[PDB]
């Protein structure tokens, strides 16, 4: 269907503004709006947005109010100043997706059947990206319904255009990593990867405890995939693996050796040049 989505930063700043802007008006926990973008092949590119008035009461899961014609004619207004953009989705800023949300989608799907849901977390505490992307599918299973209706995951990333990137780079005066290179190649990576993996395993355990007891609506598919995951882990101890690993590292070291040798001899030549350029010039002051 659709394979990945790329989000421009301008929508991030717009959403961050909108959240506080509504914070003025009322005690609303959440806000909602329309995402505009374009397509290339299986890839979606999203670039501009505007907010739409929305209301909900926690009285119950079935009492909420979204206004039609505001969106209807606002999209007309935007069309009349840039023809390239089409309505292509909607966003909200809840920390996790809510129970209403699928019934929300069935409203606005009329405007674009491919419509996708993007979550933008407004308050980061963590090293994952703030975005998420979800697309609706029916799924078949043995019993309980012919099909359920389910959100499923599409991969998302932030991108930038030629000139908005200049704009953002003007603003980030206050911090940068000292040097790109091997220290960035590590500290910007491995430690972050390990932290992410640890947090994933923590969430797995947190669910598994509330399945050993608690509410425990056991779902067998989880157990199936977990069986796969545990089966997949390799035996490192095998002799024929060890001999290969040594036969590779014992090769990789030679290149580091040679390169360090060359580096040393070049630095030596540089020292020789400096010293002879000094002893033949210092004498001129008598």
């Amino acid at each position: 269907a659709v394979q990945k989505v790329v989000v421009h930063p301008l929508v991030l700043l717009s959403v961050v503004d909108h959240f506080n802007r509504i914070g003025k008006v009322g005690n609303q926990k959440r806000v909602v709006g329309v995402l505009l973008g374009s397509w290339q092949k299986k890839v979606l590119d999203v670039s501009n947005s505007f907010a739409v008035p929305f209301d909900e009461d926690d009285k119950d899961d079935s009492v909420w109010f979204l206004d039609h014609d505001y969106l209807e004619n606002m999209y007309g207004m935007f069309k009349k100043v840039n023809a390239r953009e089409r309505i292509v989705g909607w966003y909200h800023t809840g920390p996790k997706l809510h129970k209403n949300d699928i019934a929300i989608n069935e409203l606005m799907k009329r405007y674009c059947p491919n419509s996708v849901l993007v979550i933008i977390d407004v308050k980061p505490k963590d090293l994952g990206l703030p975005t998420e992307a979800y697309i609706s599918v029916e799924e078949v299973h043995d019993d309980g319904t012919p099909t359920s209706k389910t959100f499923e995951h599409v991969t998302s990333e932030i991108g930038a255009e030629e000139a908005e990137e200049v704009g953002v780079e003007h603003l980030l005066r206050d911090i940068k990593d000292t040097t790109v290179g091997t220290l960035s190649q590590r500290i910007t990576n491995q430690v972050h990867g390990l932290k992410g993996l640890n947090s994933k395993l923590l969430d797995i355990r947190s669910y598994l405890e509330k399945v050993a007891t608690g509410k425990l609506p056991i779902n067998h598919q989880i157990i199936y995939q977990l069986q796969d995951v545990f089966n997949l882990l390799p035996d490192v101890s095998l002799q024929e693996f060890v001999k290969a690993f040594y036969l590779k590292t014992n090769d990789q070291m030679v290149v580091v050796y040679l390169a360090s040798l060359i580096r040393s001899v070049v630095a030596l030549h540089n020292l020789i040049n400096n010293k002879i350029a000094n002893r033949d010039a210092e004498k001129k002051e008598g």
Binding site: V254, Y257, L261, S264, V265, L268, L271, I272, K275
Partner: protein
């Protein structure tokens, strides 16, 4: 390097430094015995008629080369002894005339051991030269040097062979040349800067 630069057997005039074109031919065949292996030997120094016609007038060198090619090891050694005796008193070969010899002999061994795998050493006596103890000590001192990869057992008088990969040898020379260059550069480092 000599054998590569001595492949000018069609452009060497009756020069003033080697009175004999035949002496030039003898020198080039002598060095080509060591430098190059069997395909090139069999392809260049035996298929080039310009030197075959000259060698036709030099029976000793002809039989010396043919003995090594045809695996007649019995006649090889007398010719080798004659050659090394002659080159001991010759100029620009004396300073290392022994070295040369100690190559050819070991080379002969490497020309026979790789065809078979469990050859008895008794066969050498009637095929390479009489004397069991002589061959025994020769093989022992050649194994100890790190060349001619094989092994010998005395209780049953047998000789086995092995096939080391072409990696360990490609490693020792690397490590030792690295050591010497590092030593030299350290000496350079301290000799400068007081």
């Amino acid at each position: 390097q000599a054998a590569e630069l001595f492949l000018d057997t069609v452009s060497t005039f009756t020069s003033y430094e080697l009175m004999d074109y035949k002496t030039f031919v003898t020198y080039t065949v002598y060095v080509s015995m060591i430098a190059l292996e069997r395909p090139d030997l069999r392809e260049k120094v035996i298929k080039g008629a310009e030197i075959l016609e000259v060698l036709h007038s030099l029976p000793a060198v002809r039989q010396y080369l043919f003995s090594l090619y045809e695996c007649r090891y019995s006649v090889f050694f007398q010719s080798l002894a004659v050659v090394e005796q002659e080159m001991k008193k010759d100029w620009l070969f004396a300073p290392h005339y022994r070295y040369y010899v100690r190559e050819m002999r070991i080379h002969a061994y490497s020309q026979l051991l790789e065809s078979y795998r469990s050859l008895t050493l008794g066969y050498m006596a009637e095929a390479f030269g009489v004397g069991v103890e002589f061959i025994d000590q020769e093989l022992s001192r050649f194994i100890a040097a790190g060349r001619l990869h094989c092994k010998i057992d005395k209780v049953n008088e047998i000789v086995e062979t092995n096939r080391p990969d072409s990696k360990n040898w490609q490693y020792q020379e690397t490590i030792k040349k690295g050591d010497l260059l590092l030593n030299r550069v350290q000496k350079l480092s301290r000799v400068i800067n007081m």
